Amino acid sequence: VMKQNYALSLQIEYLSKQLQEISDKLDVINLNVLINSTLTEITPAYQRIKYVNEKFDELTNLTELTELAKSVTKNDMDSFEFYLHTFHDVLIGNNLFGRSALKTAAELITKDEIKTSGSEIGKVYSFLIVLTCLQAKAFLTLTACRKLLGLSDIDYTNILNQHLNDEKNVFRDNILPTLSNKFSNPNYVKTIGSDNYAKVILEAEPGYALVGFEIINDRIPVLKAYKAKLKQNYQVDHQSLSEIVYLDIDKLFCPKNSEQKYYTKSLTFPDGYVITKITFEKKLNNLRYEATANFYDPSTGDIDLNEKQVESTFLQADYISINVSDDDGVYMPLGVISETFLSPINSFELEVDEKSKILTLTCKSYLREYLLESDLINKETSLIAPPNVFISNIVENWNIEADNLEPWVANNKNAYVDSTGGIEGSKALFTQGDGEFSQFIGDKLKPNTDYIIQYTVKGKPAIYLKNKNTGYTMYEDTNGSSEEFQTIAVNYTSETDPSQTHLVFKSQSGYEAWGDNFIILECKAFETPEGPELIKFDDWISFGTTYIRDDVLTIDPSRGGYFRQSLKLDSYSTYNLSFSFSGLWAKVIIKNSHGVVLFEKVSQQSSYVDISESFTTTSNKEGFFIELTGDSRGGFGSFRDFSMKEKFE
Amino acid sequence: VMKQNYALSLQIEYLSKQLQEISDKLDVINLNVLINSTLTEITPAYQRIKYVNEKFDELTNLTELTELAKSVT
């Protein structure tokens, strides 16, 4: 009876879940009904405005254009001004039942199952900007039509400004203090990393601050991070934009075969602070990150270095583990992880879900304050869209889209530019025979620095990165007879102060070749540190009767003879202690003057039994001991070859 | 057993509350549907009447006013 009652409880819980799903479906249906309510009032005016704007685009064919202008400028019951007024009233909410279209559109955009670019504020503001630009284009079209007909000029600036101000005020007063300023990655992709050290330092200059990140799933993953100055009211300076590129994204967010520990903590900061440094460090299957934020003054716009808070996850014990096998994989973040418009970041987070093995980089932005103080008070605004393409590359005209290609020079007429070739039709460089294209890139080529030589080609290309003089080729592009365009991202490291190196593009003898999208980025990937040497044969403090000979330091049993050497450990680290004892009951204990023992290995009979075990350090680096001691009373100790190096870092 | 039966009764009461909320949401949806039924018939005439009333307000510019009056009449 108890078992069947429990089963009934489970069935009731299932019914409750079904009821919750039904309620969500009802909410969706009601939202769609409100959408229909908006559409049945807004469809014809919007359609006509869009058609008129599309038609009158060439001037901002004479007979039809004049006829259309006369039809639009005609002042009748059903006129273009009438449709503009109806559109404005519908957006404001001056309809029969006093329901505004802006609220319904904001509800539809917010309550959408698909996440595309960022927070709700960005998308709603983008929709409002699209509507306002459509209205402005319609008013400009009407003014141009009136000018073309040679009719009396009517100043439509006043009515257009009134409409835009009313719409912006309605938005700000009604639907602005309801939206959330939280944005996350739009997409997820399976990836298998490596169980090796990977440190990423997304730092910035003292006058700079991070304004967003971007992850692109290519042959080599990237971590494009945007940093720029702040002018006033959290505005991002366009001229100061800069990018940081990393390549170990897969090796950082995914384990190979030996688990990974994720230390999650919402790094929220108080209002007025802007994140200026994000550092990741996966020592050994343990991802821990910290954030550095500096105080920002909206009135002036100075990122002061005197006030600085740090929200670090390095000194916590709680963690989340994700087991990854060959069958499955953890969904690393993939997409443009930033606001719809570049803005300083307030909080950073790394959410981990064990059920689905997904990672989300939820963050926050100061877009609301900038919108309030720059655009919604009838001031002048300037928002920056995220860079969809690399702009830190040292290859001028990376994709051939503009004419008069000066950086690229052709040796002769065999090689030319093919408009049809390349990505869609972006005027790819075509090489057929001995002809080739060249471009000097030694001006921006920093000595002994890493570089990315990602490019896209078709046919039989050859992009040998030679030094012009002496014919020294620093890169090889042998083979590669693939037909369809594909990425050829290959890591590269520059030599010592070359200062003379030009990138050339040519086709191998015989087959032809097409080339486009030549980008050379500046990566700053790090490497595993060698490790410290905490224990050394220089500070072996001895007590009692001790006999140190060569490197065979002995321990005297049954008396006070014992060695000791304090060492500086870390909070969370792993150390490999290698030694070789040769004494009866000879042990190397690690005390902390409190009874806590971190390592204990005792010899049994004799001989130098080499032991290379490892131990952790818990969460207290108050200073430990490497004391050599023998609890026996007979055979003297004999310890040789001491070494304790931290694992990886 | 008595305690778990009481818990089941509480869960059933919660389900009844959820059903009542669902019924209220259905009533709201039906009201919105009737609102759409009214709007799909009343929107254009109301919009045009409001626009005409807003336009002819100064008299209760001669050329456009006369053209609009001819169009209306």
Author numbering:
A (entry chain A): 126 to 185, 209 to 797
B (entry chain B): 126 to 185, 209 to 221
Quoted from the paper:
Here we identified Vip3Cb1 and Vip3Cc1, the first Vip3 proteins with broad lepidopteran activity discovered outside of Bt from Paenibacillus strains in the P. popilliae-containing clade, most closely linked to P. dendritiformis. Vip3 proteins, including Vip3Cb1 and Vip3Cc1, are highly conserved in Domains (D) I and II involved in pore formation, with divergence in DIII, IV, and V known to be involved in receptor binding to the gut of the insect host. Vip3Cb1 protoxin and trypsin-processed Vip3Cb1 toxin structures were determined using Cryo-EM, resulting in density maps with an estimated resolution of 2.6 Å and 3.0 Å, respectively. Therefore, structural comparisons of Vip3Cb1 to other Vip3 proteins, including commercial Vip3Aa, are consistent with other results, such as amino acid homology, that all Vip3 proteins share the same mechanism of action, even though these originated from a Paenibacillus strain and not from Bt.
Artificial trypsin digestion mimics Vip3 activation by serine proteases abundant in lepidopteran midgut. The Vip3Cb1 N-terminus has the signature Vip3A signal peptide “ALPSF” motif. Upon activation with trypsin, cleavage occurs preferentially at Lysine 195; yet, the tetramer stays intact and undergoes large conformational changes, revealing a pore structure as determined by Cryo-EM. Although the extreme N-terminus density is lacking in the Cryo-EM density maps, modeling from Leu98 in DI is possible. The protoxin’s DI and N-terminal DII unfurl and rearrange into an extended 4 α-helical channel (α1act), while domains DIII-DV remain unchanged. The former protoxin α10 helix h2 leading into α5 (residues E205–V220) shifts down, becoming a more ordered α3act upon activation. In addition, protoxin α4 (residues 165–192) also moves down, becoming part of the newly formed channel α1act. At Pro168, there is a 63o bend in α1act which leads into the long-extended 4α-helical channel. The activated Vip3Cb1 quaternary structure is also like activated structures determined for Vip3Aa16 and Vip3Bc1, with large conformational changes in DI-II forming a long, extended α-helical channel. Vip3Cb1act tryptic site boundary modeling revealed density for the N-terminal 20 kDa fragment up to Asp185, and density resumed for the C-terminal 65 kDa fragment at Asn209, containing DII-V. Detection of a magnesium ion in the Vip3Cb1 channel is evidence that Vip3Cb1 can function as a pore for ions, causing osmotic imbalance and insect cell death. This magnesium ion was also observed in the Vip3Aa16act structure, similarly coordinated by the Asn (N163) side chain with a similar bond length (3.6 Å), and this Asn residue is highly conserved in Vip3 sequences.
